[PDB]
Amino acid sequence: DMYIERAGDITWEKDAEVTGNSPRLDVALDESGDFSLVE
Amino acid sequence: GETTDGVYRVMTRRLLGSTQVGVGVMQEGVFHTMWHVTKGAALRSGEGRLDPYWGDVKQDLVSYCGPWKLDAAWDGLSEVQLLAVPPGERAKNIQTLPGIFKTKDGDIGAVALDYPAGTSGSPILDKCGRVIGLYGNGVVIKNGSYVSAITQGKRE
Numbered sequence: 001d002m003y004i005e006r007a008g009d010i011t012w013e014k015d016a017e018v019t020g021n022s023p024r025l026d027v028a029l030d031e032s033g034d035f036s037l038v039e
Numbered sequence: 040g041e042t043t044d045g046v047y048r049v050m051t052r053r054l055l056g057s058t059q060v061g062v063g064v065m066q067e068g069v070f071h072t073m074w075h076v077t078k079g080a081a082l083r084s085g086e087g088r089l090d091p092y093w094g095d096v097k098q099d100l101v102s103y104c105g106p107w108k109l110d111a112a113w114d115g116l117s118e119v120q121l122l123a124v125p126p127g128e129r130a131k132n133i134q135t136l137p138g139i140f141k142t143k144d145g146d147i148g149a150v151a152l153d154y155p156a157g158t159s160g161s162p163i164l165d166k167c168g169r170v171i172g173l174y175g176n177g178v179v180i181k182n183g184s185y186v187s188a189i190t191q192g193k194r195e
């Protein structure tokens with residue numbers, strides 16, 4: 001059995017940690033909703 | 040149940056201890072998560088029940104109590120924030136510039152960040168705190184890291 005617990009307000013935060021790259025990827029989406037790399 | 044707007048954890052007891060299977064968004068009385076988190080099952084909030092209203096395995100999305108309410112879109116230019124809610128850890132804002140998933144049916148924002156699978160359905164925000172989609176459907180890359188589609192529904 002599954003339950004929910006509130007974890008926070010949905011708010012932009014000034015001086016949040018700023019990380020991650022911005023990759024451009026060719027992808028395919030199948031009927032089961034799984035993405036795959038089209039290489 | 041609790042029906043204040045905000046970001047929730049999705050928990051199960053069907054395993055060892057209490058396990059966080061995913062995350063979701065409460066907005067205008069509707070609970071929004073990814074289909075792979077709940078597999079379309081009912082949810083408890085207090086002694087309240089939340090019943091599935093809308094779902095799509097291909098979009099990997101599901102709404103509870105009503106129709107999908109979140110319609111904001113990535114601009115295609117500006118940084119965004121993942122409001123990542125990881126298992127056993129406090130909600131945290133991580134700011135990033137999305138790349139792109141190029142598909143035959145169009146381009147889609149993507150966010151290049153690793154977190155446990157129980158993070159799934161964390162909301163992605165724009166500068167005005169609007170939810171532009173849910174994190175935790177995407178693709179593994181050469182490095183073995185995850186890259187997630189910015190996955191948005193449609194509001195009728």
Ligand SMILES: Cc1cnccc1NC(=O)c1cc(C2CC2)n(C)c1C
Nearest residue numbers: 075154155156158159175176185187
């Ligand atoms: C379980 C599932 C089923 N169906 C589709 C996608 C998933 N998602 C994952 O497998 C997943 C999600 C993440 C993190 C971003 C949250 N990571 C690293 C992985 C491997």
